[PDB]
């Protein structure tokens, strides 16, 4: 803040809510406990700008996890030549897809 | 089959509240020492039937100023929510078991002022308009009664499920845990439900008819059906509130008996009521739940969110 | 006197009497004889899918134990 | 179909909002904004938030807008300016009524459809998570913490409440 | 799937249930039929004016007593936490700020509404 | 309004904006927002005139609705990051949503509109507060999300700030609305060293807040809103003319006089950031803000506007005012040039 | 950027428990006492490796600790097992409280029986 | 990003649009406004539940509870133009002009 | 003294409502502190296991914890029953 006082009197006043794998009541987890608890120990102690590029890869790993772009994308090319492939009979699905 | 037990639950209300006509035209009469309605059948059986199909027979006149899609929205929505306010009830099992159904049952319940503002808008009459502004501030002034006695009725239960309300009751009637409450609970239904003293919405004698004063034959039953589906619900639901049941599971019968007993006891008082008391007045209406219902409902609020924890009685959550 | 108003009465406890036997009965019914079971929370819920799948005909109502095991 | 059912309560959201924002009679305007509450609430249900999509009922349908309904019943301006009074209100609900047509036809074809952000026109139902709750509802157990984490909040949420009722008393008394 | 169709039979029951209201009756209205009725006289031209502030000053009260109660519906699950003197403190805080809130309001008349 | 009222509406405001300042949570930063907005609006209603309930309420539909902008600037960063933390965000669509959300809190772009017209309507003492106080808040989330901006973005916003708020000071009768278009013409230059260096930001921010108290209750002790009313105050006090010609000197820039201070420092800052077209062509608006504010120079005490008989009850009785603060605000504010190097205390 | 490894279907096919869910619910205290070595070191697994591949072998381990568990009582009183199960399957959420008298002979059974 | 998103963020949009641009009743512009955090409310909910962010179902209240506080202000400011106007037109609420 | 008397009183002689909310209120939050059940509140509280009890790694020189949910080690409950 612009004046932490949070920091300087020890009073946890809003940083318990700030991010989804701090203390959680009756210790449940979030959807992205295990990335962002990855990404927080990178980028602690380096300051912003270098935790910026130096933590890349726990970055889009755990923004991937929570929005799941790449593997909704990966999911639709799955579906869009499935639908692609099976309209035309070339390959039928087994039993266990229908049950 | 779960089509056919729905029509199995609103069609024998639709049914219920014909014959509440009935029935309330007959004790009321009595209370005034009168007979109330013998001839159409026997005991006035068919008094219902003939109030009914006669009124489906008569014009639905709309008025000349009136926005016709406006004018008919309004009793769909009323009829509706009555018919809906049933479907988390803990009838022997409830129907629709919503873990929420009390805050389903408060939501669904002052949506229904909605039927009343519009109708009073879309009819467009002064003795319309402020006979509606009045109906609404009449509702909306009550339900955070409503709101906060369940919440201390409930704390002691240990959710907002319905159906646990059996289970917590298993002993001895809740009502004995919060009598201040329940009738702090009875009169507010009144209110919502719009009966004397709580009839300046209506008014008969003074607002000739309220938000109904030109509201006439076809759809006018949807707000007297609305109506008459509430007073039964708010009972019902009062009943299962303070005035519980013990609940075999190899005999759900004899709950029902009880259940159903005790709800046509509370409804009874409901015009037990009507024919003893004056009319209340708008001062005096907002006066009463403002200055002498929310400072009570308040602090037995407070005595009861602190009470399981001084006892160490608090409730399970499932 | 008051024993009219009885006949009237009795008609509405008959009324509101059946949509608690409906819901009973059918509840009994469909689910075999059971009470539905209901699932407030999420295990409950993967309780009875489990029993769906391992009734061996898709039903959870289905209750069939001791036995299958060898 | 239930294929897409989120999909659905989403489209009469957006219709709903595209209903008022056209800006209708203040009654018809809360009609089409009540009718984008009640359809959301749908949407915050399937997702599992009872809770959250219950208090929007209770406190936004059954709550503001009810006392917008005096404000239109003390506005009462002298004629109805219902969809049928004015042509641009056409004008605007009938454009209203195009581009989210176009898009989820963008979306619903090749669904790479980069409207400021790039967004996905898969089903509803993938984005869900696999996993047990247990018997805690989390949205009930989150919600609760208002009393055990939330303290602070709790405080300055209800100083400005009781700051909420000095204020619109004192603008309200008309010096 | 059985909610919105418990939902979804009420619609319909009520709508043709107004239906065979509407259209079976033969409606048969004329212009002074349909004129709007005023204790059997004439109307001189209203229901387009303001009223006030005492029915708008309630509903405001009413609307922010309303939120402080939202606040306090999480309640029952309240009482099932770990740390209950936090959380009797707490809500024990917004009982009393609503009542500090109607407090002042009925001291600065308030209740006592406009005439 | 009660003074016990009055008191605690102030203190809420105050908090709101301490409440902003302090908090390491998004909500909490909008929490203080509204709930300041929530109280700001009675003090305009304080006189309760007609002019006043049109100043509130343009003043409330603009800040009601940056407030609730800035939630989904906070709601995108959260949907592509999940974290409320104040902090560099992660999204170029937040961080242009939220830019332009607080730029209408503080009115430097078109957004501006606001700030002339509220000031207007409402009386001296509220607009004291609005224009000096109300602009701590908006600047305080902006000092800490000073990484994350779109250099252009923000640079061209301080430069129509600067630009338009001049401008149309030539043209400006009232006092009120001189007053507010020199805020919007100020606000462009904290802002536009905002992405550069925040520590003169914040220079400029106590300094700009230095005149505008003394200004404005210097304006208070006169009881005059318009020039021709500030023009018959020379004969009822002439020492206070002479202040208010210091400072609108001051506060025009000229050295060795106070204002000069952050402008010179911001010229600096950005000439090392090899920006050096930017300062030039705001210099050269700066002279802008002198001309009018030499019209009420000269109007005020430079020449001897014509009074009017009724002055001479003025002589006779005396002010009860105690304008507190007052005589270290002008000093304050006009001659602190040699103490420049202090600045490295604000860092 | 890599491979998703998972286990061949092979080593998928473990014996499974075919039983009700009301079947595991009235044993369910009188079962996890009886199999927690296997049921701790399976559960210890799931929350040290933190991997689901990791843990099959423990993963069948569990159940074919079940099934043992499950056929016992099979050479002993299954009888009060029936009735038990069947009235903990009456009820709608397996309330214990209603059916206490079969869950009276059911334990006293394992008091000697096993 | 799933499809529903951009509906609510759609629906912001152009509730973002009916607030900016005006009619004649600001009556009409409240709404748009409420509308506005309806969505934000909305919104919220779906990445908070998606997310599992169990302490951040905190805040779709409290940005109700404080989104309602403004149509208390906003409200009573309403019939405050529509006492010394009676009306709740916007073009004749022009009055400060210079 | 004599004026808090009277005023009390002649309070319950006009308005009886908010003396009883204000004294049921003035209950509601004293007692609290005062139960001695509130202590016995959390602890049944705490005593719901709502999530499991995930094994600790036996490495030996713990004995608080059971090595089995029989033995006498670990928290006991002897109490809740009774209460
Ligand atoms: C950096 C360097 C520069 C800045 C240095 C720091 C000081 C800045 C301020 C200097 C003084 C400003 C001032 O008063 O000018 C005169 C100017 C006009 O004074 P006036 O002619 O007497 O008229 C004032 C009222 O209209 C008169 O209305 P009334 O007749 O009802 O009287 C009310 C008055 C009279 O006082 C009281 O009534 C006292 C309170 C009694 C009830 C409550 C008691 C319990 C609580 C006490 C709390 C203290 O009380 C107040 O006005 C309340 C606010 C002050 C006390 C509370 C302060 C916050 C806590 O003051 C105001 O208009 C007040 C505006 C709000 C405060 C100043 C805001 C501007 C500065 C913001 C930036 C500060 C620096 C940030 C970095
Ligand atoms: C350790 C103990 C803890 C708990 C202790 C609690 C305190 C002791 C018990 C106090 C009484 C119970 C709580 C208060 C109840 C009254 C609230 C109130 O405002 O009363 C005065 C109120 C108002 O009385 P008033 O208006 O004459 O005076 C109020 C005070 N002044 C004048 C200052 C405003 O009474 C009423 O409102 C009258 C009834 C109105 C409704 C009409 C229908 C009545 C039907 C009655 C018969 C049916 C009853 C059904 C009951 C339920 C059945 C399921
Ligand atoms: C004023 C009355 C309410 C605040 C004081 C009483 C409650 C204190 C409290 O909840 O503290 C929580 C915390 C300290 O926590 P605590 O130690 O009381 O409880 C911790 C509970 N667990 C472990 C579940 C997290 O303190 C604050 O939030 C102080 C906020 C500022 C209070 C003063 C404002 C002026
Ligand atoms: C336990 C130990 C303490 C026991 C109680 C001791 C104090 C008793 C106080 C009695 C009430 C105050 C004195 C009194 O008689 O006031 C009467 C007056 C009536 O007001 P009214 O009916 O409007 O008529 C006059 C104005 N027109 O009253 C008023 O004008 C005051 C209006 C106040 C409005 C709010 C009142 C409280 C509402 C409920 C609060 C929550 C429950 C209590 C919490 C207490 C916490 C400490
Ligand atoms: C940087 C550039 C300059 C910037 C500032 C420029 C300011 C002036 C610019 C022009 C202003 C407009 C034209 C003139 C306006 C005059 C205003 C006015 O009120 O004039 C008349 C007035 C009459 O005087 P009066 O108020 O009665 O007070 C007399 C002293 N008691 O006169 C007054 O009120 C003036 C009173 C002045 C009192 C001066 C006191 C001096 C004390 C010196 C002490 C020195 C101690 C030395 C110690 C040495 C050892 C340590």
Redesign the pocket.
Do not use: H
């Given at each position: 803040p612009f004046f932490d006082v949070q920091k300087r009197l020890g009073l946890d006043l809003d940083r318990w809510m700030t991010i989804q794998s701090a203390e959680q009541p009756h210790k449940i987890p979030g959807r992205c406990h295990a990335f962002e608890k990855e990404w927080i120990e990178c980028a602690h102690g380096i300051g912003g700008i270098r935790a910026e590029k130096e933590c890349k890869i726990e970055f889009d790993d755990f923004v991937e996890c929570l929005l799941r772009q790449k593997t909704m994308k990966r999911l639709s090319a799955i579906k869009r030549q499935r639908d692609k492939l099976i309209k035309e009979g070339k390959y039928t699905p087994p039993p266990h897809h229908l049950g | 089959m779960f089509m056919i037990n729905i029509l199995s639950l609103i069609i024998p209300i639709l049914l219920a509240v014909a014959f509440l006509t009935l029935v309330e035209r007959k004790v009321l009469g009595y209370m005034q020492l009168r007979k109330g309605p013998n001839v159409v059948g026997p005991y006035g059986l068919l008094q219902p039937i003939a109030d009914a199909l006669k009124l489906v027979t008569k014009e639905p006149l709309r008025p000349g100023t009136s926005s016709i899609s406006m004018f008919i929205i309004a009793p769909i929505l009323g009829l509706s929510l009555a018919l809906t306010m049933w479907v988390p009830l803990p009838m022997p099992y409830p129907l629709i078991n919503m873990n929420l159904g009390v805050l389903f049952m408060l939501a669904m319940s002052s949506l229904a002022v909605y039927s009343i503002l519009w109708s009073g808008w879309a009819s467009n009459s002064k003795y319309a308009l402020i006979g509606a502004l009045r109906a609404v501030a009449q509702t909306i002034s009550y339900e955070v009664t409503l709101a906060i006695i369940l919440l201390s009725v409930l704390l002691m239960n240990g959710s907002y499920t319905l159906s646990t309300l059996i289970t917590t009751q298993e002993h001895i009637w809740m009502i004995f845990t919060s009598w201040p409450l329940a009738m702090m609970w009875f009169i507010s239904t009144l209110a919502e439900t719009n009966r004397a003293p709580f009839d300046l919405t209506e008014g008969e004698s003074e607002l000739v008819s309220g938000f109904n004063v030109e509201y006439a034959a076809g759809p006018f039953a949807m707000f007297f059906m609305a109506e008459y589906a509430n007073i039964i619900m708010m009972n019902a639901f009062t009943a299962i509130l303070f005035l519980g049941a013990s609940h075999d599971p190899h005999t759900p019968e004899l709950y029902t008996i009880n259940f159903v007993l005790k709800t046509l006891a509370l409804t009874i008082t409901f015009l037990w009521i009507r024919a003893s008391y004056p009319r209340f007045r708008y001062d005096q209406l907002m006066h009463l739940l403002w200055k002498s219902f929310l400072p009570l409902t308040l602090a037995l609020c407070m005595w009861h969110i602190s009470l399981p924890i001084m006892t160490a009685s608090i409730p399970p959550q499932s | 006197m008051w024993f009219e108003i009885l006949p009237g009465i009795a008609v509405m406890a008959a009324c509101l009497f059946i949509p608690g036997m409906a819901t009973a009965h059918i509840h009994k019914f469909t689910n075999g004889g059971k009470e539905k079971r209901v699932a407030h929370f999420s295990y409950q819920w993967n309780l009875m899918e489990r029993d769906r799948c391992i009734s061996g005909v898709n039903r959870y109502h289905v209750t069939k134990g001791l036995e299958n095991i060898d | 179909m239930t294929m897409y059912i989120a999909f659905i309560l989403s489209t009469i959201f957006v219709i709903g909002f595209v209903g008022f924002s056209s800006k209708p009679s203040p009654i018809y305007g809360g009609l089409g904004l009540i009718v984008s509450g009640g359809v959301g609430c749908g949407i915050v249900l399937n997702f599992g938030g009872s809770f959250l999509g219950l208090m929007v009922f209770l406190i936004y349908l059954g709550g503001m807008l009810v006392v917008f309904g005096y404000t239109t019943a003390m506005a009462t301006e002298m004629y109805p300016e219902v969809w049928v009074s004015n042509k641009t209100v056409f004008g605007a609900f009938v454009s209203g009524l195009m581009m989210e047509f176009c898009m989820v036809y963008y979306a619903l074809k090749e669904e790479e459809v980069e409207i400021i952000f790039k967004f996905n026109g898969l089903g509803d139902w993938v984005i869900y998570d696999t996993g047990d709750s247990g018997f805690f509802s989390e949205e009930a157990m989150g919600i609760a913490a208002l009393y055990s984490y939330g303290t602070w909040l709790v405080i300055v949420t209800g100083w400005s409440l009781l700051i909420g009722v000095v204020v619109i008393m004192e603008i309200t008394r008309g010096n | 799937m059985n909610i919105m169709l418990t939902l979804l039979t009420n619609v319909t029951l009520a709508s043709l249930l107004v239906l065979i209201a509407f259209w079976l009756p033969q409606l048969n209205a004329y212009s002074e039929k349909t004129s709007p009725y005023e204790c059997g006289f004439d109307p001189m031209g209203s229901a387009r004016l303001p009223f006030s502030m005492k029915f708008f000053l309630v509903a405001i009260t009413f609307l922010l007593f309303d939120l402080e109660i939202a606040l306090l519906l999480p309640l029952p699950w309240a009482s099932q936490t770990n740390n209950l003197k936090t959380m009797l403190t707490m809500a024990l805080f917004l009982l009393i700020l609503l009542a500090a809130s109607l407090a002042y309001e009925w001291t600065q008349k308030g209740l006592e509404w406009a005439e | 309004?009660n003074?016990?009222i009055?008191?605690?509406l102030?203190?809420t405001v105050?908090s709101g904006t301490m409440l902003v300042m302090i908090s390491s949570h998004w909500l909490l930063i909008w929490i203080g927002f509204e709930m300041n907005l929530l109280a700001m609006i009675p003090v305009l209603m304080?006189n309760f005139n007609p002019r006043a309930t049109e100043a509130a309420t343009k003043y409330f539909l603009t800040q009601a609705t940056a407030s609730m902008m800035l939630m989904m600037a906070i709601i995108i960063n959260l949907l592509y990051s999940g974290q409320w933390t104040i902090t560099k965000m992660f999204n170029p669509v937040a961080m242009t949503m939220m830019t332009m959300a607080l730029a209408m809190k503080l009115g430097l772009s078109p957004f501006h509109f606001w700030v002339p017209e509220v000031t207007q309507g409402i009386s001296l003492?509220?607009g004291?507060?609005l224009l000096?106080?109300q602009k701590?808040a908006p600047l305080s989330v902006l000092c800490q999300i000073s990484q994350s901006i779109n250099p252009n973005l923000m640079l061209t916003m301080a430069m129509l700030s600067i630009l338009i708020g001049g401008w149309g000071g030539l043209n400006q009768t009232q006092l009120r609305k001189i007053m507010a278009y020199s805020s919007i013409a100020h606000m462009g230059w904290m802002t536009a060293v905002l992405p550069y260096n925040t520590t003169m930001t914040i220079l400029n921010?106590?300094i700009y807040?230095?005149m505008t108290?003394a200004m404005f209750?210097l304006l208070?002790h006169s009881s005059a809103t318009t020039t021709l009313s500030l023009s018959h105050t020379w004969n009822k006090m002439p020492v206070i003319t002479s202040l208010m010609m210091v400072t609108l000197l001051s506060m025009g820039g000229l050295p060795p006089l106070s204002g000069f201070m952050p402008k010179w420092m911001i010229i600096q800052e950005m000439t090392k950031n090899e920006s050096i077209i930017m300062p030039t062509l705001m210099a050269m608006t700066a002279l802008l803000n002198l001309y009018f504010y030499m019209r009420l120079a000269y109007s005020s005490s430079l020449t001897m506007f014509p009074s009017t008989n009724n002055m001479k009850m003025k002589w006779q009785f005396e002010h009860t005012?105690?304008?507190?603060?007052?005589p270290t605000?002008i000093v304050?504010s006009t001659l602190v040039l040699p103490m420049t190097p202090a600045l490295s205390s604000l860092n | 950027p890599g491979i998703v490894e998972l286990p061949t279907l092979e080593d998928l096919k473990v014996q499974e428990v075919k039983v009700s869910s009301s079947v595991l619910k009235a044993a369910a205290h009188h079962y996890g006492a009886q199999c927690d070595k296997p049921n701790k070191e399976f559960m210890l697994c799931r929350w040290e490796e933190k991997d689901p591949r990791r843990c099959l072998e423990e993963g069948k381990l569990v159940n074919q600790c079940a099934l043992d568990f499950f056929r016992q009582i099979k050479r002993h009183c299954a009888e009060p097992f029936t009735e038990y199960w069947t009235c903990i399957d009456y009820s709608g959420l397996q309330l214990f409280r209603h059916c206490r008298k079969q869950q009276a002979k059911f334990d006293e059974c394992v008091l000697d029986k096993l | 990003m799933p499809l529903v998103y951009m509906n609510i963020i759609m629906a912001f949009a152009i509730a973002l649009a009916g607030l900016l641009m005006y009619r004649s009743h600001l009556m009409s512009s409240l709404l748009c406004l409420e509308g506005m955090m309806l969505s934000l409310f909305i919104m919220s909910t779906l990445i908070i539940l998606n997310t599992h962010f169990t302490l951040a179902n905190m805040m779709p209240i409290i940005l109700l509870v404080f989104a309602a506080c403004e149509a208390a202000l906003g409200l009573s400011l309403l019939v405050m133009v529509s006492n010394t106007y009676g009306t709740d037109y916007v073009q004749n609420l022009n009055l400060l002009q210079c | 003294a004599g004026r808090i008397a009277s005023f009390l009183k002649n309070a319950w002689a006009k308005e009886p409502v908010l003396v009883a909310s204000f004294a049921i209120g003035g209950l509601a939050i004293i007692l609290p502190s005062l139960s001695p059940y509130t202590n016995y509140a959390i602890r049944i509280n705490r005593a719901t296991p709502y999530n499991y009890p995930v094994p600790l790694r036996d490495d030996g020189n713990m004995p608080d914890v059971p090595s089995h949910p029989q033995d006498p080690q670990g928290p006991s409950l002897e109490w809740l029953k009774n209460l």
């Open positions: - | - | - | - | - | 309004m003074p016990i009055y008191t605690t102030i203190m105050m304080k003492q509220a004291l507060l000096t106080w701590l921010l106590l807040i230095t108290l209750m208070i005012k105690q304008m507190k603060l007052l605000m304050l | - | - | -």
